[PDB]
Each structure stands twice: as C-alpha cells, then as structure tokens.
Amino acid sequence: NDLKNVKAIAIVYRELSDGSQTVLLAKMGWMFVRGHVREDEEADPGVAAIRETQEETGFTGMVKKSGAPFTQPGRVITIHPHIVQVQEASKSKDTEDTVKRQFLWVHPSEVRSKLQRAEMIQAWDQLHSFF
C-alpha cells in the first residue's frame, strides 16, 4: 500500500499549561516522525502523519498545520511536512510493540541545531513560524 516516492513528516509537539510548546525529536541524527504515505492516503497525507506518530511514539494527535510539499533525492521523493499536536495515549494495537528509539523533548529554539538531514531541516524551516 505504501507509495514508494511519497513521504510525510510530522513535527510532533505538546502544548503546555502556559501556552509554551515542546517539540519531540527521535533518533534511531535527530529526526521528526517519518513514514511512507499510503495509496489510500495520498489525497491528504496528514492521515499518514498521524498514523506514523502513533506507531512511533504511542501518542495520538491532530494535524495542526499542513505545509507545501517539497522534493528530495532518493528517484525523486515528494515530502509532505506537517505539524502534529499530540493529545492522548494511543489505543491502537499497532503500538503494543514499538521500535527502539531515543526520544527528546526540547524547546522549539533548540530543535534545528539537532537536525542533520536535509528533509528534516526543510520541513522545520517551512513550518517553525507556528511556534
């Protein structure tokens, strides 16, 4: 079902009681959530952004912003960047076992320096004005 050449990126964040935000970074350099877009998902890749957020983090959430797609080399890949706010613990049964990852919650001003891949840098520069 996965589209070979279409991906979604989810910039995961939590809203805090004072209105500040904290952004989630993962490392298997530091990355956002990433997964393939599926065929049934290609008309709104935010559906892929949420599902991949659940599979990797155990949180569920909502897409807060959908960014303009951009192109990256492999083959040419179209990337759909999103900001996803997480709200509740996922009940999906695809989260019963997660992939081992390092996680880190950071203030938005400390996000970009930790990114190493161009597609993560691109997604962040397109959308960080939200924070």
Side-chain angles (χ1 to χ4, degrees):
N1 234 15
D2 287 359
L3 300 169
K4 184 54 193 292
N5 299 334
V6 183
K7 316 203 173 207
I9 283 173
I11 298 166
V12 170
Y13 83 99
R14 280 178 304 109
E15 178 82 342
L16 308 170
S17 58
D18 67 340
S20 65
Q21 298 122 319
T22 177
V23 167
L24 174 68
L25 299 183
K27 165 174 320 184
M28 199 142 76
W30 293 96
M31 305 194 331
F32 308 115
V33 168
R34 181 214 297 134
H36 282 270
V37 179
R38 299 172 172 181
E39 184 178 332
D40 60 279
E41 281 165 351
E42 195 185 13
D44 177 15
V47 168
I50 297 300
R51 158 187 64 76
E52 198 79 35
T53 293
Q54 299 184 191
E55 295 177 356
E56 305 189 7
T57 78
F59 287 100
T60 194
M62 95 176 327
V63 173
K64 300 291 318 313
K65 298 280 180 165
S66 296
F70 61 88
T71 295
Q72 295 279 301
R75 324 135 295 197
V76 153
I77 309 170
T78 305
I79 306 291
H80 299 259
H82 313 72
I83 291 181
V84 162
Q85 177 196 274
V86 295
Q87 318 161 296
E88 318 188 24
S90 168
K91 290 163 207 66
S92 158
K93 200 183 162 72
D94 309 42
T95 71
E96 192 157 32
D97 284 69
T98 50
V99 163
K100 178 157 86 173
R101 288 183 167 93
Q102 273 182 288
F103 288 98
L104 177 71
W105 292 93
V106 298
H107 182 284
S109 61
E110 308 178 341
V111 164
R112 194 199 199 252
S113 62
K114 303 190 174 60
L115 308 174
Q116 285 175 237
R117 287 154 181 87
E119 70 189 5
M120 303 293 155
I121 298 285
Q122 188 51 41
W124 178 255
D125 295 343
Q126 267 176 226
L127 306 167
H128 77 295
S129 63
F130 171 85
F131 301 101

